[PDB]
Each structure stands twice: as structure tokens, then as C-alpha cells.
Amino acid sequence: SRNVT
């Protein structure tokens, strides 16, 4: 998954 942080 894409991680915002």
C-alpha cells in the first residue's frame, strides 16, 4: 500500500 508518511 501507498504510504502517506
Next chain:
Amino acid sequence: GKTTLNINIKTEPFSLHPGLANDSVSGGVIRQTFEGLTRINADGEPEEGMASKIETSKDGKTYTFTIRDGVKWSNGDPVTAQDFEYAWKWALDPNNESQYAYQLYYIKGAEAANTGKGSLDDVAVKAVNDKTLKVELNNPTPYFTELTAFYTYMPINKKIAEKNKKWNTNAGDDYVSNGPFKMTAWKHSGSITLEKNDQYWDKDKVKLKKIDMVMINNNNTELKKFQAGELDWAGMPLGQLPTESLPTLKKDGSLHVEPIAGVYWYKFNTEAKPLDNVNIRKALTYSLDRQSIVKNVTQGEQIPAMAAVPPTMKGFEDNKEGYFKDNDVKTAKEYLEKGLKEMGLSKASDLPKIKLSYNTDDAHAKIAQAVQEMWKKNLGVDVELDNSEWNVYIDKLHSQDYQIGRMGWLGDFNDPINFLELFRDKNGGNNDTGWENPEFKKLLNQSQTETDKTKRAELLKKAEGIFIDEMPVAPIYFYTDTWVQDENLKGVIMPGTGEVYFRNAYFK
């Protein structure tokens, strides 16, 4: 002990449809509100969730899930095998444009349906009856019960989804879920409230009654709120600590620091000049001083990345050192010169404009400013910066409306291929680079038929080698999770892949 948990999720989710979610923010919510056929227990292993029994055929390819007696959505309706069937086919329907459809390609006929070369009817997920889901995979897949715990494999309420195509876009009567919590409010760009779900089968083991998730995209403020007692957590996985505070919080012994299966990388749009030139990509990658970045910029004990697969992933420990040398300016200058020669250019000042993009966040800007400096000093390459809100940003990269783009990737299950198969296919939902390689693909697919674990691992290493050689992305560092918390908060589930489950969390 109080029964409300106050946390920051920073920003508006991409989607709270489990079939569109593809990100930590979305997942942070959905992982509380839905539950799959399996769930992750404290030891980070899959265990029975909506399925009370799981049977695998002798050949390892066919899974038969028995749906637990009495399981229900938050409106009381039963959860049925049909709900799963519909969810999974919904995500694979190309019209619905799930960025995680490829996550379901493990099921036979899944890829054909999604790519337009086959009928959704021929995807081998079948609600045999209300309490029996039958699934046939292309190959024995020992982590399939990890995939069924992942949020793309969540059920959705079929009846309501067929009635209201936009059920997922607002809290309300049309938003129902089957997990330990339910979402009772969602003010867009403001916050989300979750409450214990009284219809959840295992509700007796759920201690929190409410979780207030705020949306503060300001690391400083998050910590202030925490210091004021108005948050019970500050930092990752769902929030973020401000970097200047990590010295202090390490020194007073409050800071938690954990290595996780995740990689921070700069994705190149290989179809946008000048990033279509492999030599330019390598010059930008090799000219990075990652040890500087992790010691001086992020200060979160991150490990320099010169690889895709984190060295936590067993078989891949020597990705600690990686495929190439950090701060390798000599080699970077060689690549630049070669790429410059191919364009009929003499000097790097005369390359076309390059914009480096990230999602709005002071931490990402600090990294981008460092990297921008590295390129200026080491290569003579000018780049201009820009930033976007997270959910818009995700579409900017997916649509390739960018040149260089900050991204981070956490593992969805405990297998090295999760860091590779997202680049298998040119228009893969989570690829973003426009890159594909025939040999890379062939090896990935070969890995899925190889029965010896060590031989399989070698195939994936080969594959990774081709990836790094063509550099569609520039690895920077492998992740840690850093946070402080109210130390009365017990029972939070945080596996090595860097997600968080509050299902059995309490204050003592």
C-alpha cells in the same frame, strides 16, 4: 480506563470503498471497520475472521471458506459468501478502476476479466451457498490467507452497493461494515468517528467504544495535541511526529522506533522526458547521499535503501548493502554523461525542465530539498518542487501526470514479491512508472510456479536485479515506525508490515 481513542489520520482518505482503497490512510480506517475471511492476530499471523473454517485442496489451489455462523453487517443483515463474491468481482471490473485489481490476479480468470480478455463470470470465486465461498487460485499460494486479510479482499454489502453506486462516499444508512468498529460519522477533510460494532461476532473482545480520527496534516500540532492529552498517540502508522522532536523523545525514552517492511522511493515516469532515458534515471539515483538523509534529515533510524525488497524479508537480508553503492557520485556522473551524449547534449544545465513532486508534508519537503541540493551540487541538474494533497496526489502518479514523484510502499503481506509485482505490468494500478520488462515478468510468473523456496527466492532476486538495473524508481530508505503514545494504551496490533489494528486495544 477510558474507552475512547483519539488519533490523527492526517488527511482525507483516498477511498473508504475497500475495493478502491490503495493507501495507508484509507487502510487505516477500513482495517478497523471491515473484516475479511481471515484477520491478523497479535503475532502477525492470519487467523479465522468471517470464515470459521478454511480448507485447501490437496493440490493447494482450491480454498473452501466456511462463513461463520451468525456473522452480520452493522445494520444486522447477515454476511454471506455472496457479499465476498460481489466485492471481489467488483474490484476486478475494469470499469470500477481499482488500483489494486492485480492483488486478485492470484485467482484463476481474475487477470483475464480485469484486462478485458475474459468474463467476470469465469473468475473462480463462487458463492456456492450463503455459507460457502469456493476459490481456485492459479497456483498454490502459501500466503493466500494473508491476502484474504488484506483490504482488497474485504466483503461489501452487495444489496446496498447494487442500490446505491456511491454508498462508500459518505457515512450514513448506506455505509455498513462487518468489522469490530463501524463508521458513524465522516466530515470530509475534517474527521471520522468510529464506534464499537454491536453486530460483530467477536465484539466481546473489543474494548474501545469509540475512535475519533482527526485530520491534522501538521506534525507539530499533532504533538501539541498529544502533549495536551487530546490525542492518545502521536506519530506513525497513521500520524507523524515532527522531525525536530525526535532528539528529545529519544532522550526521554518515550519514543518508540520499529523497523518495518517498507521502502521510501522516488518513482520516475519513464514515459516523460528526460526520465525516459535509463542513464538519467541512474544518475539521479546514484548521486543520492542516503546515509545523510537518514541521519541528518529524517532522524528516524531508517536504513539506506539501494534495493526494492526490505532486508526484513527473509532471503533478502543483504539488501542492507543493496545492489549498488550509496553516494556513488563518480558512477552517477558517468551515467549522466552517457545520457547527455544520447540526447546530443554537452551540459546538464540544458536538460528539459524537471519537476520533483511529493504529497504535502514538511517531512517530504525536507527530503526533497536535500535531494534537490544533491542533484544541483553533484550533477548540475536543476529541479523545481511541487506538492499536492494526498488523495489528488495518488491520482497524479497513477495517471503519470508527473516526472519524479515521492512515494512510500509498505508490504501488504509477508512475501518479497509484494515489493515487485506492482511493477509487473505497464498499466498495473500501483506501478505508476510506465515501465515493464519481459524478462522481469517471466521471472515473477516463474516464481509463482517454483516449489522450492530457495530457488523461488533466487528467481525474485534475479528479477530485482533487472529492476534495479533499469531503475524505474530511485530507492532512498527502508522504513521505520516512530511514535509516542499514552503508555496505558495496551493491546494494539502492529505487525512488521507497518499497519495498525485497534480491534483488541484498551486503556488499562
